[PDB]
Paper text:
The proline-rich antimicrobial designer peptide [name] inhibits protein expression in bacteria by binding simultaneously to the ribosomal polypeptide exit tunnel and the release factor (RF), depleting the cellular RF pool and leading to ribosomal arrest at stop codons. Separation of cellular extracts derived from cells exposed to [name] in a sucrose gradient reveals elevated levels of partially assembled and not fully matured precursors of the 50S subunit (pre-50S). High-resolution structures obtained by cryogenic electron microscopy demonstrate that a large proportion of pre-50S states are missing up to five proteins (uL22, bL32, uL29, bL23, and uL16) and have misfolded helices in 23S rRNA domain IV. These data suggest a second mechanism for [name], wherein it disrupts 50S subunit assembly by inducing the formation of misfolded precursor particles potentially incapable of evolving into active ribosomes, suggesting a bactericidal mechanism.
Importantly, the absence of uL22 was consistently observed in most identified precursors (states: 1-8), implying a systematic effect of [name] on ribosome assembly. Quantification of uL22 and uL29 incorporation revealed a frequent absence of uL22, observed in ~46.4% of all precursors. The absence of uL22 and bL32 in several states of the [name] dataset also led to the absence of uL2 in eight precursor states (states 1-8), suggesting a possible role of uL2 as a checkpoint protein, whose binding completes a construction phase.
Numbering used by the authors:
A (entry chain K): 1 to 122
B (entry chain D): 1 to 126, 161 to 209
C (entry chain G): 1 to 176
D (entry chain 4): 1 to 38
The structure:
RNA sequence: GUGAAGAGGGAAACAACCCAGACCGCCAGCUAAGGUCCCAAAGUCAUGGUUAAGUGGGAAACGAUGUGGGAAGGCCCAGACAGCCAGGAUGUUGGCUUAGAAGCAGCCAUCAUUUAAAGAAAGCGUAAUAGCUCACUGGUCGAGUCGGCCUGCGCGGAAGAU
RNA sequence: GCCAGGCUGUCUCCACCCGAGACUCAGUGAAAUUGAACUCGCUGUGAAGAUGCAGUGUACCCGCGGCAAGAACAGCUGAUACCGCCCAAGAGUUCAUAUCGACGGCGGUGUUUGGCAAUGUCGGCUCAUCACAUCCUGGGGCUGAAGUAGGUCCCAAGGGUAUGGCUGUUCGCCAUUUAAAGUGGUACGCGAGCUGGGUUUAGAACGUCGUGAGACAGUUCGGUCCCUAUCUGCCGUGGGCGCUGGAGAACUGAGGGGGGCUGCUCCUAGUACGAGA
RNA sequence: GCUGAAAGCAUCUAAGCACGAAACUUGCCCCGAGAUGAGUUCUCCCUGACCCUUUAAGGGUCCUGAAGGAACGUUGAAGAC
């Protein structure tokens, strides 16, 4: 579960360490966003040299949720924290070719066909 | 068409073959025999009075005892009415089982919500007053399993009323 | 006034009954009734239907002419079949007619069916162009109103050609 | 369309019709000349 | 003049609007303003006219085309208004800014034979062609018809208050 | 005096638990106020928002727990100013009104400037009511509509009609979403409902006026935000009575309560056909 | 909008005469016969006697106490009472 001004971790090799959420999209007058929802985040720390620079504002998607998600059989997926990966409006293919931690099975969306290959640990 | 009155027992989960957990609310549906028939000529409309349960002879008022005797059936715990849909009629003493709901796949549940004390304006409207103990209906519910030999009924979700509360299940008007 | 002062010849084979204001016309095509206005006291006048408005009505002459016109039309219809009638239909898209239903695909994703009001001499001489007939007399009330309401070969693109046998207009197309 | 207080025959092909107590102008050449309130 | 310092009735209520100056009592009669469908007492009263819109029952200046009527005016059984089964034929594919304007864009005349009759041209559409109508002219029915002024009211104007 | 970080229901949203009151039983018990009351809503008038005047509609009599809806600011006239309209030169490839529309006239407004001469006043929060004179869901007409999108007009109030930085701000500017982030009346709604951000009850502070107390639409600080809301109105629930001998149930129903929202994709379908786009 | 004249063309209408916007109302859910216009149906219970008067919607006396409710106890996922 993610709300306005929520701390999200980093699960890509883009060099980001801390990312802050500024706006929530995916529904008019919406107060919360899910794992399979788009959010607007910024960057707090950046590597010395790289493609990502301080002050950039861009889309992102949560891959792991502290609250977790439910399953039809009653099973629940819970993580130690919230992990988010930055996404761009154009060239949706994220720069990060490696993802830390496992992923769930809800990434079968039309736009998430290229991310299922990554994250070998499920 | 016509619904039946049952008793709420509890709710749990039912696992499908594919491995999906589905909530189910347990309703005991005793064979609700018909006591009286109302018609357009006499009563002004077509309806049937159904009864369920069983009351002790010492705990049944003599007028009710005579009314049940006229129908030639044992005295139940209450009477309920269901409007006919201009379809087949019924006869007094015709026991009705849960087999009717075995091929509907869509049911609506009416009942009284659990009583509660006074709820403030923020708690109620989000004027403050007592909540619960009023008729409320939740429609478009799908029956999961039907057990004719055990007088059991299971529907998805939750239904008004606590354990042991009487409720009414009717075929889903909306479709 | 001018229409009222015009006796209408009723040929053989047509029966006219004047039950007060009620006018009943029978003939080869079939029965026909039309409750006439109370402001006209038309005389039977066998072999004619001479119209004379009742005194005390300002609208008497116009009502008498209104009567005369369609009373003559009804007479020469019951003798031959709605002299003053047609229809227009074969509707320019994939379509068909059967029983009392004309199945159509007028520019929609679902079929649109117009109920035929219990009687029609449907035909399809050519594919799609304007025509029809008189035999249906009173059952032809509108009928084509539903056909045109769904679509009236939109007068820009002509996407689907007109009706039974004759023509309709259109002018230029951009989007399909 | 025009809802002005006064309606006049702008062109030859204008007809005055009193419908529902309203004097309208109907034109068979250009619909633009159609005005409602007379 | 009223109220101040005059009661009472009417205008639905109301002090400056109308009638009207209370000595007291009567279960008597007649009037003023205002009414005579009820509420609430009186004509669902007589005659002569307007009203088709609840305008009456709220509204000004300013502009037309409804009936009732007045002054009249034009064309009218040597037959009018609306009408059209009939005609609209020929160079005038024009010189002219030749890119085609040919009447349907303009410089331009705005002619001339058939003639019971037709213009070198008013609308619809074509790159212009072409084609369909109208000015007028043959034939039948046919009697009235057309444009403005005066107006009382119907109307616009006009949109009024939980 | 400043920065970075860890740190709690201050909030998205509040969820639940322990005590003291709130409610009942037994007894003690006073006040603010009080002309008398058999103390309803709406329209109209009124020294001008009427429980008491004319009209209209509803309501069986009496209790209980409740949210609190109950000179400075707010008379006569309308030059000024705003609003709508009529005519209409013209722009618009020809064509005034598809869209604008110059010069003119006509009315309405008290939404500016104006002329005469203890009713607590602008904001923000809670709570809302009503007209469309409609921002949207909109359909329907014209289009210069060879199309969604649209440019303009008739109707629609059934419903919806934002978040943050500058102001106390109404308003306005800015950035991001949405279908839009509407116009106005309700003492420019709502302080005996909530705070007072400046102004404008009582205190005091700075500059000015007067010897003086005092005063300043000259400017800050905070500011009893007074009135046992008796009573008016409403949600819920009771005691009495009548439905005509009495009683227990099941219901038809005159009327009444509130909601009729919506994004994305899918197959249809790269579909109608369209010179192609 | 099919035909369509009046007014040999034409026109939504004059006449034979139908569709249609999510706009409006029903339809969807709940309270509701104090709706004093006080509604409909089923069942149950009472089938005594005497006296007087101002002689009739009269009064009193002895017996009777029907069904049902209330009274009190256990109490409830019903409840401030």
């Amino acid at each position: 579960m993610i709300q306005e001004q929520t701390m999200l971790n980093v699960a890509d090799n883009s060099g980001a360490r801390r990312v802050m959420c500024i706006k929530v999209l995916g529904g008019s007058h919406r107060r919360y966003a899910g794992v399979g929802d788009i959010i607007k985040i910024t960057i707090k720390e950046a590597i010395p040299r790289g493609k990502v620079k301080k002050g950039d504002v861009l889309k992102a998607v949560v891959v792991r949720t502290k609250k977790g998600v439910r399953r039809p059989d009653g099973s629940v997926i819970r993580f130690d924290g919230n992990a988010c990966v930055l996404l761009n409006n154009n060239s949706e293919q994220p720069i990060g070719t490696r993802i830390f931690g496992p992923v769930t099975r809800e990434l079968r969306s039309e736009k998430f066909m290229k991310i299922i290959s990554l994250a070998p640990e499920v | 068409m016509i619904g039946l009155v049952g008793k709420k027992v509890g709710m749990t989960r039912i696992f499908t073959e594919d491995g999906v957990s589905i909530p189910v609310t347990v309703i005991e549906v005793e064979a609700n025999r018909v006591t009286q028939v109302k018609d357009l000529a006499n009563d002004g409309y077509r309806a049937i009075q159904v009864t369920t349960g069983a009351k002790k002879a010492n705990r049944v008022t003599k007028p009710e005892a005579g009314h049940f005797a006229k129908a030639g059936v044992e005295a139940g715990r209450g009477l309920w009415e269901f409007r006919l849909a201009e379809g087949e009629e019924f006869t007094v003493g015709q026991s009705i089982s849960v087999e009717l709901f075995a091929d509907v796949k869509k049911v609506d549940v009416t009942g009284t919500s659990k009583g509660k004390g006074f709820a403030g304006t923020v708690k109620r409207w989000n004027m403050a007053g007592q909540m619960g103990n009023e008729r409320v209906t939740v429609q478009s519910l799908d029956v999961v399993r039907v057990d004719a030999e055990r007088n059991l009924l299971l529907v998805k979700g939750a239904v008004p009323g606590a354990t042991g509360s009487d409720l009414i299940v009717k075929p889903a008007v909306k479709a | 006034s001018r229409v009222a002062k015009a006796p209408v010849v009723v040929p053989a084979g047509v029966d006219v009954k004047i039950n007060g204001q009620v006018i009943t016309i029978k003939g080869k095509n079939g029965e026909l009734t039309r409750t006439l206005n109370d402001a006209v006291e038309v005389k039977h006048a066998d072999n004619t239907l001479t119209f004379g408005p009742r005194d005390g009505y300002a609208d008497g002459w116009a009502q008498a002419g209104t009567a005369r016109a369609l009373l003559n039309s009804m007479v020469i219809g019951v003798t031959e079949g709605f002299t003053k009638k047609l229809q227009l239909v074969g509707v320019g898209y994939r379509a068909a007619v059967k029983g009392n239903v004309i199945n159509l695909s007028l520019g929609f994703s679902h079929p649109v069916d117009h109920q035929l009001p219990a009687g029609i001499t449907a035909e399809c001489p050519t594919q799609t162009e304007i025509v029809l007939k008189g035999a249906d007399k009173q059952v032809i009330g509108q009928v084509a109103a539903d056909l045109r309401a769904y679509r009236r070969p939109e007068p820009y693109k002509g996407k689907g050609v007109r009706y039974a046998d004759e023509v309709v207009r259109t002018k230029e197309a951009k989007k399909k | 369309m025009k809802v002005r207080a006064s309606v006049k025959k702008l062109c030859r092909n204008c007809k005055i019709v009193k419908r529902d107590g309203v004097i309208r102008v109907i034109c068979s050449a250009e619909p633009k000349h159609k005005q409602r309130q007379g």
